[PDB]
Design an enzyme around this catalytic site. Structure first.
Site: not given
Length: 194
Positions: A44, A77, A86, A88, A178
């Site tokens: 990741n 982000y 958080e 997005y 990502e």
């Protein structure tokens, strides 16, 4: 030979790069607003360039090359504190929608497309402040693209109208690429056009 984790300033832009160390991958900061990421399978990872602090209403332009081979996303982000959030704004993605496990909050029309809105909570997980509990706010573009302008204030007002709190103290605000257990390549340039 994986590039080590890093965050800070490059050519007047803030950047963040993190990986779990499982995938081979190279993150390079290029001139001005540009960054490049080449990655393999195995882990990741997320990286990109932008600003610190973020603003509720910034007009962000991005362009470049985005070529995921599997699960991945391209999004505006960032984080706020008080409350810990958080968020997005997802402009493009590979095989799976990263917000599929969140609560549906309806739609909004922003910058030429409908966006689907969502909210989720993560308990006792990695964050900017160590292991914490935080909310995630999602806004996902229905018509995927790799270049254009995002008026972030269209999304923060939609989240506010849905009942979510958007008066937190901003940390960074980046255009991030990502990858999640799949390989890919991206070269992206960002700019503040407001």
């Amino acid at each position: 030979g994986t590039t080590p984790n890093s965050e800070g300033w490059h050519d007047g832009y803030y950047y963040s790069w993190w990986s779990d160390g499982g995938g081979d991958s190279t993150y390079t900061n290029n001139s001005g607003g540009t960054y490049e990421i080449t990655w393999g399978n195995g882990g990741n990872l997320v990286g990109g360039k932008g600003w610190n602090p973020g603003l509720n209403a910034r007009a962000i332009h991005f362009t470049g090359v985005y070529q995921p081979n599997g699960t991945s996303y391209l999004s505006v982000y960032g984080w706020t504190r008080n409350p810990l959030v958080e968020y997005y704004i997802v402009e493009n993605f590979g095989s799976s929608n990263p917000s599929s496990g969140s609560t549906d909050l309806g739609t909004v029309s922003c910058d030429g497309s409908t966006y689907t809105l969502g909210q989720s909570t993560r308990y006792n997980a990695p964050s900017i402040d160590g292991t914490q509990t935080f909310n995630q706010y999602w806004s996902v573009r229905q018509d995927k693209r790799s270049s254009g302008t995002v008026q972030t204030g269209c999304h923060f007002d939609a989240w506010a109208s849905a009942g979510l709190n958007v008066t937190g103290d901003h940390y960074y605000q980046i255009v991030a690429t990502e990858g999640y257990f799949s390989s890919g390549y991206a070269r992206i340039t960002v700019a503040d056009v407001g």
